[PDB]
Symmetry: D2
Amino acid sequence: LDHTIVKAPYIRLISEEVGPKGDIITNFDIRLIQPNENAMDTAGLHTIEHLLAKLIRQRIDGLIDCSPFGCRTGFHMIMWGKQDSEKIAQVIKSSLEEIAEGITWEDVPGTTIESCGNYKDHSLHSAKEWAKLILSQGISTDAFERKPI
Amino acid sequence: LDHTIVKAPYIRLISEEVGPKGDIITNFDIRLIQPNENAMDTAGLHTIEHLLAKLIRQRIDGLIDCSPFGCRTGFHMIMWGKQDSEKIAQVIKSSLEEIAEGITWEDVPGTTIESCGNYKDHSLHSAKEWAKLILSQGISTDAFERKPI
Amino acid sequence: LDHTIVKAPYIRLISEEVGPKGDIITNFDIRLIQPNENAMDTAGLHTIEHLLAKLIRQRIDGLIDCSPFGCRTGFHMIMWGKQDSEKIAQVIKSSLEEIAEGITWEDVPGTTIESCGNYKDHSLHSAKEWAKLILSQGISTDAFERKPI
Amino acid sequence: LDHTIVKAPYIRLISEEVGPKGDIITNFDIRLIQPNENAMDTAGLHTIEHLLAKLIRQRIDGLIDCSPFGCRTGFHMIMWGKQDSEKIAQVIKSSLEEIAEGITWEDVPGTTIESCGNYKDHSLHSAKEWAKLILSQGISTDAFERKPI
Ligand SMILES: [Zn+2]
Ligand SMILES: [Zn+2]
Ligand SMILES: [Zn+2]
Ligand SMILES: [Zn+2]
């Protein structure tokens, strides 16, 4: 991927893989922030990871994992089956809208020393303001051209 | 998982997943740091993420993804097929040893503004030093008892 | 200073600088975290920095600045005039108790986009939890020998 | 200060304080990054803090302290004696030009486990790239109007 030509926020299919018995696994680039222009702080990124794990699964089947990028500009989404980015775009948009306006502290799973490996590094405040910032730019179903929604 | 009773560094099989056509996937908790005692800085975590993606693929097949935890105490690793924590521990130990000694700056893939979403946030110094710190503690095949390899 | 042999949390006087006309300025190392064993996440550190600035001024005059170390293990405190490392200890301890016990979000100053240069990177959750952790280890008045206030 | 309308990078005199014997201390806002649009990662910020400490002293007298902002968009600079925002801008510009081109790993002070409280969290690569990015935008002598030197 040439990171200098994409336009975030976008949803991008990274790859599809076929297992031996023929199951398909799709990998998605969920870019929340424009590469090299900004990066999410660890606390909000961490809280958004916990929330997205929950919210996505309420909205769609087949989620294997949703882990953040080391570069902190988004999330790697792994799913069973072919998926297509417009459905994924709507799942992410809807989830972000819930984080922006709906989630309270008690809806954030795993914020104790027993259930999380860095439980101090959380921030609902950061997650809500990031979600709002990301939503205000529109979620595009294409990475190279703006196609919001 | 009770993060208070584990002993890091460890490799722990999280789950095996069967897809619709019977294909097996395995998810691994690659725990490099004791939960809630410390956390990797973003720069070294990011460089390690890049190097692991390359080093793991050189040593084993069927890697689907290896993404850092939002808590910054390790990596979530996903593979095709049944795998068991013993061979994964070896692959991880061997990769960390190469980071610790062998690797130079030109061996780190994706450190340019075109190839990476946050290309400034890298540190080979950090990656090397973290690698050696983790190695010095030993990599266990069990999360609850020290069984180093 | 040899960071390997200090015992944190501690307060340490670093130096007294004398002005051109004889005013004295004192520098303090406020070490909240054991060097190289851990480090505070940016959001907690940022929130604590906002709170400390206000809370310290409620308790003592002559504060010139209280800035976070680049290493994220504590704060640099600059004060007008000669000052006692023991009274500094009480002022910090008293401040941490309030963050731990009696601070709400509305009591954190400068948490808006107009008033702070990274207003999303805040966490009262992190600040409160770190303050509790620090207080429970005790604040020493000496860097090399546990002398808790 | 209204952070929404400043135009970074800039140098801004925050305040002068007088001591009982008539000594002047000047405080500066060294804003390297546009508030709320981006933030320096900890490693780059940490390495720059170590370098700015020596580089500034080689160029001007009276430096009391140069500490990072908790918001990670710049540095707080404290000096003996009367200001000169234009002269301060020149020193900062000159120091950044040195970081971008003249500094090697061995030129960074405090990068061992004895001499630094988080010695793994350093990155010459990050410091150099940030220094280049900042210089490409120009250092203004006025926070509100671009007067780049
Ligand atoms: Zn967590
Ligand atoms: Zn990257
Ligand atoms: Zn702030
Ligand atoms: Zn340092």
